[PDB]
Design a protein around this nucleic acid. Structure first.
Ligand SMILES: [K+]
Ligand SMILES: [Mg+2]
Ligand SMILES: [Mg+2]
Length: 217
RNA sequence: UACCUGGUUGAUCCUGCCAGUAGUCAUAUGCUUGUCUCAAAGAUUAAGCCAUGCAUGUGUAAGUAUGAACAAAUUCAGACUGU
């Protein structure tokens, strides 16, 4: 079936780690998509966003390969992006799905004004940049909806954000750069230091130290 | 009610524009047009030229009646006292 090759995979298969937040807290790399499948796999949905052909000139013609972009998300604060180039479209799509699962990230959602109910928009103004494409996300009031182009709108819907305003600059027709900039903007949500995070951190044992005895075999 | 997409390359990222998408109590034109309620309408070029018809007249007890205007009365007198 599945034979984990990493300590994190072994712990996830042994059920010692039960939530993705435990991994996110210590920022441990995730190198097996089976971890994501076991943890948040049931609630994950994938979508192919673009099949982009690329060509390399050769002495006997052009070698064509296809680029697959895949967006995965749970619609509840977890989203991931994957890009895979391969000779076959099916292989490219499979690799892109695996990469998106591996690259899933947590997304912070806040409130525009009054803080009643679950979060509906980004906690603060954020900006992501990939190549020449810059995507800016601004909080919006409840009921404003997702004001964004189709690609960022799909990314935000998979991330689970209810309402937001967006602005874009640069060559947004470059779909890869557009989606990557949106992903970077979403990732930057948890990197902003707000007053509510001013409390001193109370550290906890990392998984590798907590279950060191189990992993010692 | 804070949104983009196609087009320079063998392929890539850009600048950059062209094209597309939507709107006008915005004009005109093409085709089509069964019912109800609303409703603009010779401004844009020529404040260019105009046949014909109409669009400014007016009376209360209280300015002026002798129509040779009508009507009722007067057998005798009457300036006039209804229109
Ligand atoms: K008018
Ligand atoms: Mg604007
Ligand atoms: Mg060509």
């Amino acid at each position: 079936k599945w034979v984990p090759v990493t300590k994190l995979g072994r712990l996830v298969k042994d059920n010692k780690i039960r939530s993705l937040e435990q991994i996110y807290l210590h920022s441990l790399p995730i190198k097996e998509f089976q971890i994501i499948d076991t943890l948040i796999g049931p609630s994950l949905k994938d979508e192919v966003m673009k099949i982009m052909p690329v060509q390399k000139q050769t002495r006997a013609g052009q070698r064509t390969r296809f680029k697959a972009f895949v967006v995965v998300g749970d619609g509840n604060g977890h989203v991931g992006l994957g890009v895979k180039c391969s000779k076959e479209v099916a292989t490219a799509i499979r690799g892109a799905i695996i990469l998106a699962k591996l690259s899933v990230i947590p997304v912070r959602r806040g409130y525009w004004g009054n803080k009643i109910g679950k979060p509906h928009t980004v906690p603060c103004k954020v900006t992501g940049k990939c190549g020449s494409v810059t995507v800016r996300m601004v909080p919006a009031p409840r009921g404003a909806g997702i004001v964004a182009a189709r690609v960022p709108k799909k990314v935000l819907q998979f991330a689970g954000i209810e309402d937001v305003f967006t602005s874009s600059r640069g060559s947004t027709k470059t779909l890869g750069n557009f989606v990557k900039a949106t992903f970077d903007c979403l990732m930057k949500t948890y990197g902003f230091l707000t007053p509510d995070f001013w409390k001193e951190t109370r550290f906890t044992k990392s998984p590798f130290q907590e279950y060191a005895d189990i992993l010692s075999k």
